[PDB]
Design an enzyme around this catalytic site. Structure first.
Site, PDB file in Angstrom:
ATOM      1  N   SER A 129       1.005  -1.088  -0.047  1.00 16.16           N
ATOM      2  CA  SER A 129       0.087  -0.138  -0.166  1.00 16.16           C
ATOM      3  C   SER A 129       1.107   1.150  -0.024  1.00 16.16           C
ATOM      4  CB  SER A 129      -0.855  -0.199   1.118  1.00 16.16           C
ATOM      5  OG  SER A 129      -1.905   1.102   1.200  1.00 16.16           O
ATOM      6  N   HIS A 183      -7.402  -5.743   0.825  1.00 11.33           N
ATOM      7  CA  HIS A 183      -6.255  -5.052   0.765  1.00 11.33           C
ATOM      8  C   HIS A 183      -5.178  -5.348   1.901  1.00 11.33           C
ATOM      9  CE1 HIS A 183      -3.909  -1.496  -0.754  1.00 11.33           C
ATOM     10  NE2 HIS A 183      -3.973  -0.833   0.586  1.00 11.33           N
ATOM     11  N   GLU A 232      -9.069  -5.399  -3.917  1.00 17.03           N
ATOM     12  CA  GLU A 232      -8.084  -4.185  -3.258  1.00 17.03           C
ATOM     13  C   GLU A 232      -9.119  -3.234  -2.778  1.00 17.03           C
ATOM     14  OE1 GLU A 232      -5.392  -3.777  -3.003  1.00 17.03           O
ATOM     15  OE2 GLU A 232      -4.197  -5.027  -4.380  1.00 17.03           O
TER      16      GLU A 232
HETATM   17  N1  LIG Z   1     -12.165  10.663  13.064  1.00 17.81           N
HETATM   18  C1  LIG Z   1     -12.289  10.973  11.745  1.00 17.81           C
HETATM   19  C2  LIG Z   1     -12.978  12.106  11.340  1.00 17.81           C
HETATM   20  C3  LIG Z   1     -13.123  12.420  10.018  1.00 17.81           C
HETATM   21  C4  LIG Z   1     -12.854  11.578   8.988  1.00 17.81           C
HETATM   22  C5  LIG Z   1     -12.074  10.376   9.294  1.00 17.81           C
HETATM   23  C6  LIG Z   1     -11.682  10.111  10.897  1.00 17.81           C
HETATM   24  C7  LIG Z   1     -11.573   9.523   8.138  1.00 17.81           C
HETATM   25  C8  LIG Z   1     -10.991   8.109   8.695  1.00 17.81           C
HETATM   26  C9  LIG Z   1      -9.385   7.831   8.633  1.00 17.81           C
HETATM   27  C10 LIG Z   1      -9.001   6.571   9.114  1.00 17.81           C
HETATM   28  C11 LIG Z   1      -9.750   5.803   9.801  1.00 17.81           C
HETATM   29  C12 LIG Z   1     -11.279   5.906   9.841  1.00 17.81           C
HETATM   30  C13 LIG Z   1     -11.676   7.220   9.281  1.00 17.81           C
HETATM   31  N2  LIG Z   1     -11.862   9.679   6.905  1.00 17.81           N
HETATM   32  C14 LIG Z   1     -11.378   8.944   5.853  1.00 17.81           C
HETATM   33  C15 LIG Z   1     -12.005   7.770   5.110  1.00 17.81           C
HETATM   34  C16 LIG Z   1     -11.211   6.962   4.029  1.00 17.81           C
HETATM   35  C17 LIG Z   1     -10.743   5.440   4.594  1.00 17.81           C
HETATM   36  C18 LIG Z   1      -9.403   5.708   5.088  1.00 17.81           C
HETATM   37  C19 LIG Z   1      -8.781   4.441   5.690  1.00 17.81           C
HETATM   38  C20 LIG Z   1      -8.855   3.530   6.709  1.00 17.81           C
HETATM   39  N3  LIG Z   1      -8.156   2.509   6.629  1.00 17.81           N
HETATM   40  C21 LIG Z   1      -7.850   1.546   7.738  1.00 17.81           C
HETATM   41  C22 LIG Z   1      -6.529   1.191   7.879  1.00 17.81           C
HETATM   42  N4  LIG Z   1      -6.271  -0.317   8.273  1.00 17.81           N
HETATM   43  C23 LIG Z   1      -6.049  -1.311   7.172  1.00 17.81           C
HETATM   44  C24 LIG Z   1      -4.623  -1.387   6.562  1.00 17.81           C
HETATM   45  C25 LIG Z   1      -4.551  -2.476   5.512  1.00 17.81           C
HETATM   46  N5  LIG Z   1      -5.549  -3.369   5.471  1.00 17.81           N
HETATM   47  C26 LIG Z   1      -6.625  -3.391   6.057  1.00 17.81           C
HETATM   48  C27 LIG Z   1      -7.921  -4.194   5.795  1.00 17.81           C
HETATM   49  C28 LIG Z   1      -8.905  -4.293   6.415  1.00 17.81           C
HETATM   50  C29 LIG Z   1      -9.142  -3.192   7.483  1.00 17.81           C
HETATM   51  C30 LIG Z   1      -8.231  -2.348   7.754  1.00 17.81           C
HETATM   52  C31 LIG Z   1      -7.036  -2.238   6.995  1.00 17.81           C
HETATM   53  C32 LIG Z   1      -3.042  -2.749   4.746  1.00 17.81           C
HETATM   54  C33 LIG Z   1      -2.217  -1.477   4.768  1.00 17.81           C
HETATM   55  C34 LIG Z   1      -2.148  -1.060   6.247  1.00 17.81           C
HETATM   56  C35 LIG Z   1      -3.598  -0.315   6.680  1.00 17.81           C
HETATM   57  N6  LIG Z   1      -7.540   2.417   5.538  1.00 17.81           N
HETATM   58  N7  LIG Z   1      -7.749   3.638   4.799  1.00 17.81           N
HETATM   59  C36 LIG Z   1     -12.534  10.951   6.541  1.00 17.81           C
HETATM   60  C37 LIG Z   1     -12.797  11.182   5.033  1.00 17.81           C
HETATM   61  C38 LIG Z   1     -13.449  12.605   4.627  1.00 17.81           C
HETATM   62  N8  LIG Z   1     -13.530  12.798   3.466  1.00 17.81           N
HETATM   63  C39 LIG Z   1     -13.743  13.267   5.648  1.00 17.81           C
HETATM   64  C40 LIG Z   1     -13.522  13.040   7.233  1.00 17.81           C
HETATM   65  C41 LIG Z   1     -12.989  11.740   7.628  1.00 17.81           C
END
Ligand SMILES: Nc1ccc2c(c1)c(-c1ccccc1)[n+](CCCCCc1cn(CCNc3c4c(nc5ccccc35)CCCC4)nn1)c1cc(N)ccc21
Ligand SMILES: Nc1ccc2c(c1)c(-c1ccccc1)[n+](CCCCCc1cn(CCNc3c4c(nc5ccccc35)CCCC4)nn1)c1cc(N)ccc21
Ligand SMILES: *[C@@H]1O[C@H](CO[C@@H]2O[C@@H](C)[C@@H](O)[C@@H](O)[C@@H]2O)[C@@H](O[C@@H]2O[C@H](CO)[C@@H](O)[C@H](O)[C@H]2NC(C)=O)[C@H](O)[C@H]1NC(C)=O
Ligand SMILES: *[C@@H]1O[C@H](CO[C@@H]2O[C@@H](C)[C@@H](O)[C@@H](O)[C@@H]2O)[C@@H](O)[C@H](O)[C@H]1NC(C)=O
Ligand SMILES: *[C@@H]1O[C@H](CO)[C@@H](O)[C@H](O)[C@H]1NC(C)=O
Ligand SMILES: *[C@@H]1O[C@H](CO)[C@@H](O)[C@H](O)[C@H]1NC(C)=O
Lengths: 537, 538
Positions: free
Chosen positions: A201, A441, A328
């Protein structure tokens, strides 16, 4: 009495490692080696400085602090989310690396594998169970290195052109760990002349950025990009966009009460958690697979956009292993697309799919989003909730991973690199995410690191044999730049990916199968058509 | 009279007729060929709506085909059967408004379902006298009353100066409407049922059938319809009032007529019919294929709105329609204007010849729209492969012009209450002289529907004769009941109605009926849903 195999003298002084038990025998682990001066106080947002020498024997028997980051609270106590969350204390003093070597220490220089974790440049740690170098070291006799690099505002908040916050400092932390390896890995029996970078990633995007940045190119010889690339919609931002987000967060933290210096100084006076609290509020639109503070196209670390660099670069003496997982974009949907949940089958309506496309492709115009919807709709069953659910996953993974990977593979191949591509299709028997998420992913990592080899983890016998196969592909690649075994004569062989034949392999419980064209028609849509649609906007 | 065959003497509203007893394989048929249905549209009547034929005296001789409407004669491959078979087989004349009737011999005792054939030829050519339009087999084998008429083509049938009285446009469609009224009044004299009239046509003929569906004054003249490889909607079947005005004015200039409409039209009326024909092709806005100069106009009269608007908003509750396509709709069009294409070579083209061809095949497309077409039809595994590029060029032309307008029509009709039956005709005639690469070209199902394989002299196979018989039964069961299925036969695979939900159509080939789902569904969503939004925003 002290174990001589646990005593190493590195340029900075002496270290004491720990003898760890792996299924097949012992390994020597050197955890929490400092590679940089703690990037705290006035050093926040600044490039890393090399660690100063120390007196005595520094204890390197435990993992060090995890870089200051946001902690995921989506599904509290759930293994599926928790496994990616910090497993050590959060601290801005986190610039440490880990080394796993065979026990006893190899007699001859051994190929080195350097792991760069993912987590959208906002999270991650090299201490996570799935990044355990124990198995690779024991079973394959590899020297495995992993480092912590600064994430979020701390690693990537930039006021481009300033001296105090130039941006890409998290990438510089990684470059410093790479230099550390060049200078000290021979003390552990590692070959500095055979260094393979591998990451998943944001980690894979980081690997790509080291390929595209000339000062990093002298620090490694081969590269592995698992489900991530330097090119694409999420891995970088422009100087303008980084300046906007940095200014907005400063405004959000009541900073300043003008000049780059003034603003950065006031951001330095703020408690770490204050910066994290507002980190997510600087994104331009409601989106998924978008991260606030990521590498910036600065004209320094990145001399031009990764797209420009991959199209014009010379990759003649480079070997690269690239690939994707079966699903993915599946997990990204539970983090922001209405109608999606880990607790239900996530069967969505058409209206929900159209809404999800605006979130999944946030940069897309009404026409571009219509082009996406019309391409991913099954016109035989256009209202079928299962097709709509799976099409939403495909939109996110193709846009963000599969087609940037297809684009990188092709450009590298055309420009002299030796490329090997794969599709990882095996779903762990142990997986707790719903069946609809398929192979999400990041769930190939535990197989590459060889976790199935630990009987306590309750993986199947086939999974243990499969993990062993993967460990061999990866280490043969690290050893030779070819994932094929020179001993094995009944295979079938993993062919190099080429522009002409577009050959890649399936990695699953069955023997290697050769396929041609990595989602070729669909990626021509994203890589060739959609840019022309947004360029005439 | 007194010594003549009493089965060949019939009276119509116009007067007395003498037909001819023809030989069909299975026995005799009555034929009444060259029946006038309108006043000859010559002199001051050129470009004017048809006037009903005034009654004649004596017994009009209806034993031979009449004149073919003035039209362009194809000289692409001179003496070649493949082109020649579509060419006029009678003298060219502006005095061409005649119809033909085939009935069983002896004439049926009870009212028989009527089948009315409307020929194709891009509204610039055609004739009801062509061998492949021979009604003798359908009449003999199925006991059908088969009617076919000549309608004015080219400038004569469709040159319009919209809003004028002297050249209102769509007069060729009015000629067809007049032959339909003639059938309502006179077909009962031949044993035909005026209360069971099925229209059938191919290409421009199928577009004509569709225009009769969409024009209220024609709707009372028929009960069922068959659209073979053509539709009223689509890129070629109609033009706007503006575009028709432009082309008529340019044509007038090219022949010496300087544009008030009265003056212009009067001058065009002084011109030799051949002079118009010699300049007909010079008024097209771009280098193109599957585009015809003088076609029906959206006048706000015959066509109250665009066929697209009419199919999207119309009520088709009490309507039964049979629609379909051939395997290779666009294949022959390529030898008429796309560089690199020939009937005499395998036509293996380069990527450059494909990009050039797409611009000719989709002439109204912008650079971006043409790019979307190229990206969709390219095989990204083998994007330079000459065979794929050749076949992709055929698919572009056939999908754009036929398959997807047909799919659009079937879906809209089905959603708006019609009973639709759709097909794909995949059998290539053993007798075909066009190259193998052309597959099943546009119009080569006709000879099978008309039952020509039944003539042993035509050297078709035994399977083709059995297959022609199957088709004749589907078509006539459809004409009889509005359902192509035989109520006597049982599995005997059933032909299901096409629906928006199941999108069911059948394969028509030598093998028994096979049911398929979705008519080029992904590709047609590209043409029917995406491309309009691309041209509506760019
Ligand atoms: N508190 C708060 C307030 C506001 C917002 C947010 C958080 C978030 C947010 C970010 C991270 C986690 C949860 C939420 N998003 C972002 C949402 C997008 C998703 C982000 C994301 C979250 N994760 C989880 C990371 N963990 C994982 C990872 C991997 N695999 C996985 C497989 C399953 C579950 C989790 C996995 C492989 C690589 C390592 C990280 N990966 N990408 C926003 C988007 C906006 N437009 C507006 C406001 C917010
Ligand atoms: N002399 C001259 C001068 C200028 C031009 C042209 C001719 C022609 C042209 C028209 C007809 C035949 C030959 C050439 N076009 C070509 C445009 C139309 C040609 C397409 C066409 C040709 N035909 C032949 C008619 N007969 C057939 C028909 C059918 N199938 C067939 C299958 C194979 C062969 C012939 C078939 C289905 C049923 C009805 C007619 N039908 N449609 C132009 C396009 C421009 N943009 C500009 C200038 C010209
Ligand atoms: C699938 O689940 C989502 C999320 O709902 C939550 O998880 C469920 C398993 C259950 O525990 C719910 O009570 C939780 O709220 C559903 O969408 C939400 O539905 C609730 C009402 O139940 C509504 O108040 C929220 O606004 C919705 N949120 C979102 C993001 O859509 C969704 O309807 C479920 N789908 C199916 C197929 O049942
Ligand atoms: C096919 O032919 C096209 C037209 O060329 C003409 O016809 C051929 C059959 C010859 O008789 C030739 O002398 C004529 O000029 C060509 O434009 C095209 O390149 C040809 N394609 C291939 C693959 O040969
Ligand atoms: C493996 O299974 C055993 C027996 O059911 C159980 O006691 C143990 O906790 C399991 N291990 C894990 C890691 O879940
Ligand atoms: C039919 O076959 C015979 C014998 O080969 C031949 O002489 C005749 O010309 C053919 N006719 C047609 C219509 O092909």
């Amino acid at each position: 009495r002290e174990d001589p195999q646990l005593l190493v003298r590195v340029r900075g002084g002496q270290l004491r490692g720990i003898r760890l038990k792996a299924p097949g025998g012992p390994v020597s682990a050197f955890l929490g080696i400092p590679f940089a001066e703690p990037p705290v106080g006035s050093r926040r947002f600044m490039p890393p400085e090399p660690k100063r020498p120390w007196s005595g024997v520094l204890d390197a028997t435990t993992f060090q602090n995890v870089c200051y980051q946001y902690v995921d609270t989506l599904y509290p106590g759930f293994e599926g989310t928790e496994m990616w969350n910090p497993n050590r204390e959060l601290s801005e003093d986190c610039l440490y690396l880990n080394v796993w070597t065979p026990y006893p220490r190899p007699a001859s220089p051994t190929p080195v594998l350097i792991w760069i974790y993912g987590g959208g440049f906002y999270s991650g740690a090299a201490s996570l169970d799935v990044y355990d170098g124990r198995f690779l070291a024991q079973v394959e006799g590899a020297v495995l290195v992993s480092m912590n690099y600064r994430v979020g505002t701390f690693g990537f908040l930039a006021l481009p052109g300033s001296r105090e916050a130039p941006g890409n400092v998290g990438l510089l932390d990684q470059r410093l760990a790479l230099q550390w390896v060049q200078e000290n890995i021979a003390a552990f029996g590692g070959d500095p002349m055979s260094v393979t970078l591998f990451g998943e990633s944001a980690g894979a995007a980081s690997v790509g950025m080291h390929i595209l940045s000339l000062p990093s190119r002298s620090l490694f010889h081969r590269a592995v990009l698992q489900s991530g690339t330097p090119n694409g919609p999420w891995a970088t931002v422009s100087a303008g966009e980084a300046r906007r987000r940095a200014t907005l967060l400063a405004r959000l933290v009541g900073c300043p009460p003008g000049n780059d210096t003034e603003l950065i100084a006031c951001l330095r006076t703020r408690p770490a958690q204050d910066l994290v609290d507002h980190e997510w509020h600087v994104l331009p639109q409601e989106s998924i697979f978008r991260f606030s503070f990521v590498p910036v196209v600065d004209g320094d670390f990145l001399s031009d956009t990764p797209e420009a660099l991959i199209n014009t670069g010379d990759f003649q003496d480079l070997q690269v292993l690239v690939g994707v997982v079966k699903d993915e974009g599946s997990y990204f949907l539970v983090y922001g697309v209405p109608g999606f949940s880990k607790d239900n089958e996530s069967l969505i309506s058409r209206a929900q799919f159209l809404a999800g496309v605006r979130i999944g492709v946030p940069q897309a115009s009404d026409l571009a989003a219509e082009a996406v919807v019309l391409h991913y709709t099954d016109w035989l069953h256009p209202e079928d909730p299962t097709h709509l659910r799976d099409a939403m996953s495909a939109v996110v993974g193709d846009h963000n991973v599969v087609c940037p990977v297809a684009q990188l593979a092709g450009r590298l191949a055309a420009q002299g690199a030796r490329v090997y591509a794969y599709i990882f299709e095996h779903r762990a028997s142990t997986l707790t995410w719903p069946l609809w998420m398929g192979v999400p992913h990041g769930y190939e990592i535990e197989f590459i690191f060889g976790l199935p080899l630990d009987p306590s983890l309750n993986y199947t016998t086939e999974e243990r044999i499969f993990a062993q196969r993967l460990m061999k592909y990866w280490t043969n690649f690290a050893r030779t730049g070819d994932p094929n075994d020179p001993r094995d004569s009944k295979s079938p062989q993993w062919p190099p990916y080429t522009t002409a034949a577009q050959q890649y392999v399936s990695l699953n419980l069955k023997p290697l199968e050769v396929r041609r064209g990595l989602r070729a028609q669909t990626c021509a849509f994203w890589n060739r058509f959609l840019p022309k649609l947004l360029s005439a906007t």
